[PDB]
Every structure is written in structure tokens, then in C-alpha cells.
Amino acid sequence: VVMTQSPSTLSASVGDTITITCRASQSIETWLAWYQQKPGKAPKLLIYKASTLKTGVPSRFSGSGSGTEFTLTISGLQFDDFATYHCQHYAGYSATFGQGTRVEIKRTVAAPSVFIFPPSDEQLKSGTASVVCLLNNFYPREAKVQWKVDNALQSGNSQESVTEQDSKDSTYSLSSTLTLSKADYEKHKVYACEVTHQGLSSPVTKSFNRG
């Protein structure tokens, strides 16, 4: 059995009625459950056997379906409902999940403001160079950062982190840190981060020359 959820990302306004769909590759009768999960938290059971609400779950959640087509409806989104939702086929001794649906607050497209920061002299004197690229206040969440050193595409030497949706303007921000030893950092001249995003008609690059 393969479970397919749609959409992968659902953008909506507070108070909306929204539906999330889950399709099974073969009939599973009503052996389907829905979970909510907030970032860094445990999944929480909402509904099981397709339509039974778990005690204590608010009545604005409801589910329906049987066989291969299932739907979760949230009738009047509250701020607490913006989260990921997972469907699950559960059998006696095994289970399988859909890919999850992230429900977010909808706003207009906003391109990232991009900033690049070279390593501080202090850190550099210790033997390590952290170069940081910041993508500030963008929407939607999908953005891509590529680092290039002397026009050389980097791979495997950077880590990223992204904020949750801003409570006032509903944007995301992202920081990417490229880490290199003081020695390797002094091997090249131009350091640049290249950003693509739905709000950019062409990629944006911010760069600096070592020294």
C-alpha cells in the first residue's frame, strides 16, 4: 500500500475551511488515521477509522472517505491549526504514511532580501571561517541557496536553518553557513551566495572578495 497526500503545501487564511486529501494505491476500507504535528514536537492523533474524532480534539476537524479516497476537513482554521498533517494507513502489525501536508498562512509573494557576511577576524584567527548568507523575509518557503567560491559550486560544506512563519508578516527567513578551515578559506578570493526563489525572476547573487 502506498499513500499519497495532496497538496504538499496548503496556503490559506485564518478562518478558512480547507480540505486535505489522501489516496491509497489499493482499498484500505476505513483503516485510516490523521495526525497533526508541529515542528520539533510529537505527532498528535486527530481522527481514526477515517472519521472518528479522538476525544478532546476540536469539532472543527473532520474526516471522511472509504476505500481509496480520504479527506481531512478543517472548518474554520485557527492560528493553532497551522502545522503539518499526516495521513496513515494502519494495519494489525504495520503502517504506512502519506508524505504530509504543511498548512501555512497565505500572503503575497515576497522576494528574499539577501545579505552575505564574511568570517569575523576573531574566529578567523582561531583557524575556522564561517561565511553566512541570510535570506530575509521571503514567501513562499521554498528557496534555494548555492555557494560559489571562485565560481566553484560548493557541496557538502554548508548547513541551513529556516525560521517559522513570522507572526506579524507571515514571511520566512533562512540562514546558510558555509564552514571552512582558515587554511582552505585563504585558498580562494571570491565568495558568493546565489539565491533562487519564486519572487525572483532570475537568481540573485551576493558576494565579497576575501580581504
Binding site: 557576511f117 564574511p118 582561531s126 564561517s130 541570510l134 530575509n136 536553518s161
Partner: protein, 218 residues
Amino acid sequence: EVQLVESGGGLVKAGGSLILSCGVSNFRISAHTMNWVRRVPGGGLEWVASISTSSTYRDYADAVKGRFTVSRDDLEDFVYLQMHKMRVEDTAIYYCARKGSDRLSDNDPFDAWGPGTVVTVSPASTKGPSVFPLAPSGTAALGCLVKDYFPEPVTVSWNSGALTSGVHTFPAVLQSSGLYSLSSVVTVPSSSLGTQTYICNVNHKPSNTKVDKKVEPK
């Protein structure tokens, strides 16, 4: 020949947890009391824990009681050792050993041993961050890089909490070194870069470390 093989050793920080397992070949564990033993760096052996048949009793050395747990899985023939709140002196090679003999009797020696798994406990249970400035090169962006700390979390404020608008403190990332790193940024008017002072207040409660870093143009 009967065989045992331990899995799960490695490097642990003091105060951390590590779980070992033991599987076997060519005998069933259910008829045997199963044991964990460790060889400390000085060369001697130390009995650690035992679990009797049917799990009637689980016995522990005084040095590990309340921190370690032994479990047995008689159906697929595994033994487990949970090690919690680990201490530098838990550093050792850990062996699984069965109580048994050529003919099982009321009280047998340890007649079969695994090759051992190495467990190393490092002394530092915490480490405070290094804090480096993210220097501002309309609107300008500046921040602080809070690097190489353990464990989470770190909290960051700006100008002792007076500057909140425009601040983004990012989720930490786990570096390949096992130490955490996060950046906190703020966007501000470019006109304020000459007059306004910007200080990020980094607090790391686990290591009781506080750092105030002033961020200014290069």
C-alpha cells in the same frame, strides 16, 4: 562454537546515554544468566550487571546501580544494557558473557564472552558558545554567530531586550562535530549604523555562560 557479539559502543559525553546490545550464535540464551563485564583502562575486569533466567532478578554493580538497566530478549536471543548519566569512569571495553559451563550446574563460571565493544566517555558535559559578530557591510542587516556549544538551548536578546523588531534567531544546526551553532540577525535602518550601539546577549544556561557582544561596522 558458541559466540557472542556486542554492538553499540562509541563516544559519549559525560551525563549522556548509550545503549549496548549483544546477539549470539549456536546457543539459546534462555537457559543462562547473562552478564555485562567491562575492562577498565588499568587492565582489570569489573562485573557490571546480570539478568537471571526468566528475569527473576536483575543485579547491578554498586557503581552503576540506578544508572544502568539490563534487559533480555529470549525469543531472538539478545541482551541489552542501557547506560544513563554516564561518567568518565564508565570508559571501558564492554563484554557480554554467559554464565555456563560444559555441563550446566547450580553455579557456573563465565564460559563464553563476546569480543567487546569500546565505550569512551568524555569529561565535558557542557560547553559554552563562542560568539562572533555578523558585521553590517536603506536597510542594513547585522547579527551574531553563536558557534560550538552543547547541549541546547541558547537564548539571544538584543540590547538587553530593547531591540525586538526585525530580529530573527534561527534554529540551531547540529554540526558534524556534534556541537550546535545558531545565528541571530536583525535588520535596522542604515542611518543608525553610526550612532546606535547593537549588543546581542547570548545566554547558555547549561554551562552558565553569558556573553555580550557589540556588533559594529568593520
